[PDB]
Paper text:
Pyruvate kinase (PYK) represents another attractive glycolytic target. This non-glycosomal enzyme catalyses the last step of the glycolysis (the irreversible conversion of phosphoenolpyruvate (PEP) to pyruvate; Figure 1A). Like most PYKs, trypanosomatid PYKs are homotetramers. Because of their role in ATP production and distribution of fluxes into different metabolic branches, the activity of trypanosomatid PYKs is tightly regulated through an allosteric mechanism known as the ‘rock and lock’ model. By using a combination of enzyme kinetics assays, circular dichroism (CD) spectroscopy and macromolecular X-ray crystallography (MX), we demonstrate that sdAb42 (one of the sdAbs raised against TcoPYK) is a potent inhibitor that impairs enzyme function by selectively binding and stabilizing the enzyme’s inactive T state.
To gain insights into the structural basis for the selective inhibition of TcoPYK by sdAb42, the high-resolution structure of the sdAb42:TcoPYK complex was determined through MX. A general overview of the crystal structure reveals that four sdAb42 molecules are bound to the TcoPYK tetramer, which is in accordance with the stoichiometry in solution, previously determined via analytical gel filtration. Interestingly, the epitope of a single sdAb42 spans a region across two TcoPYK subunits linked together along the AA’ dimer interface. While CDR3 contacts residues from both subunits, CDR1 and CDR2 each exclusively interact with amino acids from the A’ and A subunit domains, respectively. Interactions are also provided by the flexible TcoPYK B domain, although these could not be observed in all copies of the asymmetric unit as not all B domains could be built due to lack of electron density. A comparison of the conformation of sdAb42-bound TcoPYK to the enzyme’s R state structure and an inspection of the tell-tale features of T and R state trypanosomatid PYK conformations show that the enzyme resides in its inactive T state when interacting with sdAb42 (the signature Arg311 flip is displayed in Figure 3C). A first finding that supports this idea is that the sdAb42 epitope is significantly distorted when TcoPYK transitions from the T to the R state (Cα RMSD of 3.70 Å). Based on the sdAb42:TcoPYK crystal structure, we hypothesised that sdAb42 inhibits TcoPYK activity by selectively binding and stabilizing the enzyme’s inactive T state. Since the sdAb42 epitope is located relatively far away from both active and effector sites (∼20 and ∼40 Å, respectively), it seems highly unlikely that the observed ‘slow-binding inhibition’ kinetics are the result of a direct competition between sdAb42 and substrates and/or effectors. In other words, the binding of sdAb42 to this AA’ intersubunit site is proposed to prevent TcoPYK from ‘rocking and locking’ into its active R state conformation.
Numbering used by the authors:
A (entry chain A): 2 to 500
B (entry chain G): 1 to 130
C (entry chain B): 2 to 90, 187 to 501
D (entry chain C): 2 to 499, 515
């Protein structure tokens, strides 16, 4: 029980856990150089997030090139992720970067591209061209996360409106518009979104963070847009409004993973609720054995200060305790004065929470929900984690070429590293968002074919021995596919490391 | 993972004073620990002996401890911005002649037990002649 | 299992649970008025904290009289706590502390928040200072540094309660460590069956803004999940611009976390940690809570005079409110700091001695009826002592509430 | 839970279990014919018992040769057991087959080797030679099974004793006598025992039912008595006196299996306790993973009637519920009018009681006795049984050359058949005495070397297909050794039968 565990914790004993959780880092001005990326990889990064709501294909090509380079230098396999800009009534490019609005003021809200950047305290641009036809005089316009509300007074012109400012606010370039009445009927993928996705498939990204996903049909649209040239890239649905919470079950089934965008959620739902919502979404994800990621608002203040607030640290630790596979930084590492240090703090938080969690509880919980009879595949992975606990194995080594098996093992949440020996680099890259997992590449072309699965097993055990997981006389658990399975691993082996 | 680099030993007159310095590079990337996360101990090994606790300082400098032999004479402090630990030694006496080490523990809190430290400096000779 | 509970939570269902956690409020300029005190009380406060680091004896006498008055008007038993100054910027009881502690004892405060507690010896020095006139007042030891955490077990046996000053802890030890220390200390208290409170850095930004940050909110929720009996406000209610809204915010968070926690995990954990010949006291208490679960009782009415029983039933964390029918008013006030308890007072002088133990029971059932907990047809667990036993509860009755 | 199982039982539903307990038949006048034996085998015999208490090497040679011929005809592997006569006082032979005594008579008991076949109401022979020197006047000499008591009155010659009969009981022939008096200095293996053991070894028996086992050192003496030629033969210690129960822990450790002889036991200890001793012994054997057999007093009334009594049936059923591996028939099959019929009843009782047992209780109870960190060997076997339960496997197929693994899997008591593919016919025959196992033989010489361990797996799957156990679509659990180590199986796969 957690209780017994908790009463046994000591602040004074060093911790000893090999970090299970994974860290996603957004790239931008502070971290786009190759030396920066190398320090980010050394100091814990598993996925590099390219945030397409800003920047040109040139800026993002630089990131892709630079990360592949730093990785190579380091001999790692780093995931690259594309975060879509997404359907969003947006507005920005303010003349001098900014405009301040006082209550009682009147302001022009235009859909003319001539003011698209010359947006002043009197006239600014809103990206939706149907706004004059959808908002009538009287209703409001929520600008910058419901912080700055405007009351429509008149349809001043064909594509401009004269509005009444409720509360003072400092509006910076490109802040989201959140029209309270719906019937906006927003799509799954803007025309920019689509183009960007082809750029991504064309450059070889490993996962899409699709933004503002509300229904399952839209995840399907994202898939369609990725095409067959990228039928294998992960789609990670970004849950950021109440619709996505509402349809979380359909969405989870149509996605490869989930991202809980807490600060976006926070504009429509109260904070005490957002807490609950995170517990439900992460746990559903756990049960589905899909990756789930906590994003918005993590060590926010560490963008400018050398240390976060305790409140923020507990916030991260909660995400871990709650079940999250990954934590993502967004601007802590993009524009921040302490990129590496914040990554290393995330590493310390992850290990502390991991050491602070009863190792068996999740295994037992997940196992009790499993309907019986289990499939063979399910049973193989379940009982591999169970055998691990029972013999006190120090590593599970799964040979998988797609990564399915390693994800199913990680769902059962063992208390040891999972090592995946794969023949595909894309699988190394994509496994970076699955808890406990580390991959190991067997270039078949440059070696045998390993039909007897033996040099791949050696590759795995060699990795575990050199990375401190396992020693002479330790037991390990080998999960792989037999000679005779259409697909999937169905064999397991309990081996002892030999001197 | 983290490495320590000592400087400052020598010969001194009974009653004089020296300042030992230890500079830190590197990290235990696995854990996410750096000099600024780790408590630091200072130990000494006199000729023919094992190696004994002298003093210790917690990660952020907020806690220190000293053996009675050196209380009121020795002061451990640290500058995390410069990745450096200091051991200021005043009113040195012949009984302080020994080789002196800094060591770093993967804990925010220090120990007096040498086996509980993870990385060491390579040691410097301090000789107090009267 | 918590996992199964989580996967069926919904952000859209109104939540229906009676708040089991208790809020402590610090009093200052924004809230010393009797009207303002009444507002705190209506908006969920159960104990008033006096910070003896600032303010004169006259100033706190003012707060004591004003809380007693506003409480009297609302018909509530609010506790009063005296937060010691401590040896601040070494001994345990500063001379100032001694005079402050006797002032509190003479003026009838319900508990001491002993500051900078490091060893169990120091909490016993505090108990000595309280004297026989304060023999029965709660000593709540404030853990605010590393010696406090190192010696937490001795400090828990010697104290009545423990308070985690997480901001104070964060000065010597790193934040991730404070996270772990909080879980350790809360649960050690949970097992010990003694109240634990979380103190600093709570909704601090609400001191000046009308809503807090989401990180702050999860920090409070995470205290509740961690097991804490009470949360405490500090500047939020003393200097703050929104004292009433922040207490209400604490109430909403407490309820949501409570409804998100799995009802049986605590009970099963605490019970399985017990040794196999249980003592009859412990047995009656656990089995009452157990019986409440098995029969889905909506209330547990316990007849304690000292409140011992109420603390013990609380340790097993039942699903429903615990109504304590007591005859000592100081118990009404001290019980405001234990989770799920709500005291009803029976004046033994003004009403005939309830030797039968039967009018107190009725009093309790009527309280539960009006509050809204129990309705005709519902079951309740009644726990008291028999005509002849040695000063502790030993019998338990199961009652179906009837139209009356 | 058994309660929950019990209240769901129906007497009108046909049972559909595969018989897991095993039946041992002793061979005698009604069944020694090759045709009789084939009928016992078809009826469900797994081991043929030879009571060496009676019979010549020529007779037992004949039994041996006939059972091999009958098995060869039916394509079966039947185990042969040799039950020792043991260090047991015997009562010569009596002329005209019988002789009766009345209390108040005087009868001589001589040890003069003469009169061995004469044997009259007036003077008869006994096995012990120093009987005149040990039992002194007044001593109580109990014959048959304590049924008769005699009091020693006279000294007579160096060879003979005059005793007063305290009875009313008719003797049958070459009965045994168990005299309570001490200074008996009981041997472990008599000269007759020793030569009988060699005959068995030289003729190739599969197992010894060692008689009257009291101490562990006796079991070692028996082992010694079998030379290098007999190191592979199982010894099953027959527990038949109070000392047997006294030392059961040492004797279990030293033996390959235990036989609970309840009649023999009932002569020295009260029935009520025999019941308890049976529970104790059987369960300790289950936890040790060694076979235990119940032997005397089984369906004794069926030697001459075509129906057993209900209490007799429940006695058998109780042994199975209790945990017994095998039940053993004695006279019922040796000198009885209904040999095939009583074996078929044993088959029916086994199936009924196995089907009324709760599938999972024994697996759980044994698994919770296990100290944690389990050995890999133990982990592999227990985990294969839990896998079988979770996937609702219809068969476990283990590839074991000595059978150690098959016994370890059986110890965890799965609910489906266990098929053991061996390269050793001795193993096929010896596994006949463990619950739920069925052997399939791979002739290394006839076919390949099955290095891959593939032909054998096919042999096993094929078998379970023809046997009626599995159909295309069902799941099977396969346990074997990898091709990098030897000694014990450490590898497991979950396979769906295809056809």
């Amino acid at each position: 029980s957690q209780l017994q565990h908790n009463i046994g914790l000591s602040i004074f004993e060093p911790v000893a856990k090999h970090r299970a959780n994974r860290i996603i880092c957004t790239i931008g001005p502070s971290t786009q150089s190759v030396e920066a990326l190398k320090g980010l990889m050394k100091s814990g990064m598993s996925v590099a997030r390219m945030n397409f709501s800003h920047g040109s294909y040139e800026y993002h090509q630089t990131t892709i090139n630079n990360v592949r380079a730093a990785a190579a230098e380091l001999g790692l396999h780093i995931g690259i992720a594309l975060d879509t800009k997404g359907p969003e009534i947006r507005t920005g490019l303010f003349k001098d970067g900014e405009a301040t609005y006082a209550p009682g003021d009147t302001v022009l809200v235009t859909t003319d591209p001539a003011f698209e950047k010359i947006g002043t305290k009197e006239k600014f641009y809103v990206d939706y061209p149907q706004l004059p036809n959808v908002v009538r005089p009287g209703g409001l316009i929520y600008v910058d996360d419901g912080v700055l509300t405007l009351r429509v007074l008149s349809k001043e012109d064909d594509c401009t409106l004269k509005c009444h400012v409720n509360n003072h606010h400092r509006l910076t370039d490109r802040k989201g518009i959140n029209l309270p009445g719906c019937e906006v009927d927003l799509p799954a993928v803007s025309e920019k979104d689509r183009k960007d996705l082809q750029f991504g498939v064309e450059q070889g990204v490993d996962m899409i963070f699709a933004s503002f996903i509300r229904t399952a049909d839209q995840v399907r649209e994202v898939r369609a847009a990725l095409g067959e040239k990228g039928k294998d890239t992960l789609i990670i649905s970004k849950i950021e409004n109440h619709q996505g919470v509402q349809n979380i079950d359909a969405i989870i089934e149509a996605s490869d993973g989930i991202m809980v965008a807490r600060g976006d959620l926070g504009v429509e739902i109260p904070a005490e609720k957002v807490v609950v919502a995170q517990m439900c979404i992460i746990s559903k994800c756990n049960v589905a054995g899909k990756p789930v990621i906590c994003a918005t608002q993590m060590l926010e203040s560490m963008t400018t200060n050398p240390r976060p607030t305790r409140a923020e640290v507990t916030d991260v630790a909660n995400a871990v305790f709650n079940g999250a596979d990954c934590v993502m930084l967004s601007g802590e590492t993009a524009k921040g004065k302490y990129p590496n240090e914040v990554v290393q703090y995330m590493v310390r938080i992850c290990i502390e929470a991991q050491s602070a969690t009863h190792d068996s509880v999740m295994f037992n919980s997940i196992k009790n929900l499993q309907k019986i009879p289990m499939s063979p595949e399910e049973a193989v992975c379940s009982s591999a984690v169970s055998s691990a606990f029972e013999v006190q194995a120090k590593a599970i080594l799964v040979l998988s070429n797609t990564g399915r098996s390693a994800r199913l093992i990680s769902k059962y949440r063992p208390n040891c590293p999972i090592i995946c020996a794969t023949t595909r680099l894309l699988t190394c890259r994509q496994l970076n968002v699955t808890r406990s997992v580390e991959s190991v590449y067997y270039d078949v072309d440059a070696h045998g074919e390993d039909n007897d699965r033996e040099k791949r097993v050696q590759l795995g055990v060699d990795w575990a021995k050199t990375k401190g997981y396992v020693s002479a006389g330790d037991v390990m658990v080998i999960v792989h596919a037999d000679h005779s399975v259409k697909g999937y691993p169905n064999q397991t082996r309990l081996v002892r490391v030999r001197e | 993972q983290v490495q320590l680099q000592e400087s400052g030993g020598g010969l001194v007159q009974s009653g004089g004073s020296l300042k030992l310095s230890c500079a830190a590079s590197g990290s235990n990337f696995s854990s996410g620990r750096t000099f600024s996360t780790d408590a630091i101990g200072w130990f000494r090994q006199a000729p023919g002996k094992e190696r004994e606790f002298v003093g210790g300082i917690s990660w952020n400098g907020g806690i220190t401890d000293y053996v009675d032999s050196v209380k009121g004479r020795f002061t451990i402090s640290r500058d995390n911005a410069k990745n450096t630990v200091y051991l200021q030694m005043n009113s040195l006496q012949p009984e302080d002649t020994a080789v002196y080490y800094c060591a770093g523990r993967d804990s925010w809190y220090f120990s007096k037990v040498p086996d509980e430290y993870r990385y060491w400096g390579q040691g410097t000779q301090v000789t107090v002649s009267s």
